[PDB]
Write a protein that binds this ligand. Structure first.
Ligand SMILES: *[C@@H]1O[C@H](CO)[C@@H](O[C@@H]2O[C@H](CO)[C@@H](O)[C@H](O)[C@H]2NC(C)=O)[C@H](O)[C@H]1NC(C)=O
Ligand SMILES: *[C@@H]1O[C@H](CO)[C@@H](O)[C@H](O)[C@H]1NC(C)=O
Ligand SMILES: [Fe+3]
Ligand SMILES: [Fe+3]
Lengths: 31, 679, 48
């Protein structure tokens, strides 16, 4: 049945200031 | 709750107005996730200090002399952000306290009695504590309470924040003493206004005040300052006749709740945009309606206070002793015949037993106060709870930076005349085994290392300096696979090989089994590949001299100590294989207790020293149970130091340079805290 | 989920509210910038 993972775009990182969060989803910013 | 706004104190409506402007213009450049300012209004500084203590405010800026009123119980505040006053090329943390008077008034410092005086506030540094403390012991008894006898010494004065109901003479020039900018005589500009209006004859300010208020050179040409040795002097050469130096104004905060990182974030991002004329629109260090609001006008930037430095270390020992003896009112006599007993410092319960036994075997001249790590005990010598201790040169360097001098040294070679003869110092070696004959000083990478402790000479400085020349990395957990270096951070592998448990792992004291010289030798015997110890470690531990089980089976022959070129040479001749000369351990103390520690220790070592045989059944100061308690076990006598009592004099040039090549790499917080003092 | 719940609580918390009709121009600027930031957190939080 299910043996693999197709989606990875939940992985992310923010800045060192933790002010801006990047997503791998579109459009990567709330701004 | 946004939970990142920083509430703040304002004293009056002018400072509240500058607080609101500061809020509006600091809203712009910071993101909305970042910190923000909230303005809380109080009536004086004291209501603000109680407000921060009762969690209604978070920060305020005040003098050093009010930091002494701030860190007392139940307030328990702490300085967190200092500030510098010079140009950005040379930051100056201190500033100068001066006494500014009208021209040709015709009195020196001795003829000061009964003149009208203008003080900048009750308890502030350059206005109250330095001017009163200079002329303090000339007042007639009773000195207590202070401001009563000061109120009799002066014929009318203005000191803000003093009690006008209980004392009228302090509030004689000023109509009613008020702790605000709303008082026209409060502050640096207020005291100089008290001089300019002619209501006062002398005003006490800092050096920059007359340059701030006056812009015409003739107005600088009239007013004068009086000196310590009773001369007049013009104000432009203020470096010659300053009364005393003082630390900066400081932002205070709570001790536990803080919060430090958010104040430093906010004031840092305010500093880069608004402080030194970066924007013409808003100014951080000036305002049109009032001056000296929220900060000084003479400040030019902020500096972070390191996390080890509290208030009592921030003010120094001399200034805390001055404010305490001034507030209580003792005016000391100091006969040099008698001496109070010495408060020796010990650590971690294996030093305390032998210290207390020495306190009873001595008649009473030695008393014991203890700590848990040696960095706490150096600070405990600095504050005043302790007097002297014995350190190796790696910590005699640090305590030499903090302001301590070495008095006596330890000799490690027997002679008929050892007390007068200076010793050249012991050697630092690395020890490997015969079973691992493939080892070379050229290749130590990925091999297991054993150290004495972080910061010591033969264990840390001499090896990692040479390895710092070879690797060019500051970190040493990458070059070595594992090892045991006590005092390191818990996250490194250098604590992953050590042995003590539980929660006593890598604690730099005798609770760790691998601490010291002999403990590092147990690191080499049990789990290590190389050890870094002194050159005499193997003859003491091997040969069946230790009654411990691990050391009786060890032979002196099969160990071997490697040179720096790559040659493999045995233990009996250390003079072939030595990394560098290390200086001896020394006894350090403060400057004022130099003579008494000298006399008590020489008088004390003649009774309990090295000539005492039959050690069990009696007392020995130097002979210990193989753990080097309070001294190193091979110490024959304590050599007298004359003409060489300074860390750079005693330690010699090559070792000081060798630590100076490791200057950017050391991670001890106490060195950082003692190096913030230097401008 | 924490960001979504906080943004909903902030916007509804402003809709509780004192409801001022009159603001200053900079107050209008941080006003619109503020609530636009909150709704931005809501949209990004939804897709996440
Ligand atoms: C360690 O001390 C011993 C004895 O104190 C030193 O031996 C010296 O040997 C010379 C031989 O000519 C004598 O004249 C000296 O009187 C001895 N004593 C001193 C204090 O020099 C030995 O040289 C010392 N070794 C080290 C490395 O310090
Ligand atoms: C050795 O110690 C004993 C102990 O009382 C003392 O009498 C003697 O003077 C000491 N000798 C020297 C040379 O210091
Ligand atoms: Fe000041
Ligand atoms: Fe040492």
């Amino acid at each position: 049945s299910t043996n693999t993972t197709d989606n990875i775009d939940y992985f992310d990182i923010s800045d060192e200031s933790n002010y801006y969060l990047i997503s791998q989803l579109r459009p990567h910013f709330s701004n | 709750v946004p939970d990142k706004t920083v509430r703040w104190c304002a004293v009056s409506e002018h400072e509240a107005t500058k607080c609101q402007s500061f809020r509006d213009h600091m809203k712009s450049v910071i993101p909305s996730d970042g910190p923000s300012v909230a303005c809380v209004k109080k009536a004086s500084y004291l209501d603000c200090i109680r407000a921060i203590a009762a969690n209604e405010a978070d920060a305020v800026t005040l003098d050093a002399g009010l930091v002494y009123d701030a860190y007392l119980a139940p307030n328990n505040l702490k300085p967190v952000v200092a500030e510098f006053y010079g140009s950005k090329e040379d930051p100056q943390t201190f500033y100068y306290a001066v006494a500014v008077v009208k021209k040709d008034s015709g009195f020196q410092m001795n003829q000061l009695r009964g003149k009208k005086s203008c003080h900048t506030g009750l308890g502030r540094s350059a206005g109250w504590n330095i001017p009163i403390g200079l002329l303090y012991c000339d007042l007639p008894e009773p000195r207590k309470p202070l401001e009563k006898a000061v109120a009799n010494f002066f014929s009318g004065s203005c000191a803000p924040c003093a009690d006008g109901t209980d004392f009228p003479q302090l509030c004689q020039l000023c109509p009613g003493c008020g702790c605000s900018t709303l008082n026209q005589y409060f502050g640096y500009s207020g005291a100089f206004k008290c001089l300019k209006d002619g209501a006062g004859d002398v005003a006490f300010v800092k050096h920059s005040t007359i340059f701030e208020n006056l812009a015409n050179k003739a107005d600088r040409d009239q007013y004068e300052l009086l000196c310590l040795d009773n001369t007049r002097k013009p104000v432009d050469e203020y470096k010659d006749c300053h009364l005393a130096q003082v630390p900066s104004h400081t932002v205070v905060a709570r001790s536990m709740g803080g919060k430090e990182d958010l104040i430093w974030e906010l004031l840092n991002q305010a500093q880069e945009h608004f402080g030194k004329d970066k924007s013409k629109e808003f100014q951080l260090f000036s305002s049109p309606h009032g001056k000296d609001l929220l900060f000084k006008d003479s400040a030019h930037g902020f500096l972070k206070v390191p996390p080890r430095m509290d208030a009592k270390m921030y003010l120094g020992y001399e200034y805390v002793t001055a404010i305490r003896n001034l507030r209580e009112g003792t005016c000391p006599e100091a006969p040099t015949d008698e001496c109070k007993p010495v408060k020796w410092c010990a650590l971690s319960h294996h030093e305390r037993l032998k210290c207390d036994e020495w306190s009873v075997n001595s008649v009473g001249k030695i008393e014991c106060v203890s700590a848990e790590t040696t960095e706490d005990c150096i600070a405990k010598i600095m504050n005043g709870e302790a007097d002297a201790m014995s350190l190796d040169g790696g910590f005699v360097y640090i305590a030499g930076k903090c302001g301590l001098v070495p008095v006596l040294a330890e000799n490690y070679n027997k002679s008929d005349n050892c007390e007068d003869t200076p010793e050249a110092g012991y050697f630092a070696v690395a020890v490997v085994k015969k079973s691992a004959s493939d080892l070379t000083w050229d290749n130590l990478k990925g091999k297991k290392s054993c150290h004495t402790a972080v910061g010591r000479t033969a264990g840390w400085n001499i090896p990692m300096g040479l390895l710092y020349n070879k690797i060019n990395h500051c970190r040493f957990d990458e070059f070595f696979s594992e090892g045991c270096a006590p005092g390191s951070k818990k996250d490194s592998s250098l604590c992953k090989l050590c042995m003590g448990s539980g929660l006593n792992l890598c604690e730099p004291n005798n609770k760790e089994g691998y601490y010291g010289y002999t403990g590092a030798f147990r690191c080499l015997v049990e789990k290590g590949d190389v050890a870094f110890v002194k050159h005499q470690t193997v003859p003491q531990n091997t040969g069946g001299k230790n009654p411990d089980p691990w050391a009786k089976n060890l032979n002196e022959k099969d160990y071997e100590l490697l040179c720096l070129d790559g040659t493999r040479k045995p233990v009996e001749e250390y003079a072939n294989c030595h990394l560098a000369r290390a200086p001896n351990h020394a006894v350090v103390t403060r400057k004022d207790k130099e003579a008494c520690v000298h006399k008590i220790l020489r008088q004390q070592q003649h009774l309990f020293g090295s000539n005492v045989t039959d050690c069990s059944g009696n007392f020995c100061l130097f002979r210990s149970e193989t753990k080097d308690l309070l001294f190193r076990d091979d110490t024959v006598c304590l050599a007298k130091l004359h003409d060489r009592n300074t860390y750079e004099k005693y330690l010699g040039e090559e070792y000081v340079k060798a630590v100076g090549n490791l200057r950017k790499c050391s991670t001890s917080s106490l060195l950082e805290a003692c190096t913030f003092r230097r401008p | 989920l924490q960001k979504v719940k906080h943004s909903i609580d902030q916007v509804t918390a402003l809709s509780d509210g004192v409801k001022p009709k009159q603001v200053t121009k900079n107050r209008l600027k941080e006003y619109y910038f503020n609530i636009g930031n909150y709704y931005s957190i809501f949209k990004f939080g939804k897709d996440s």
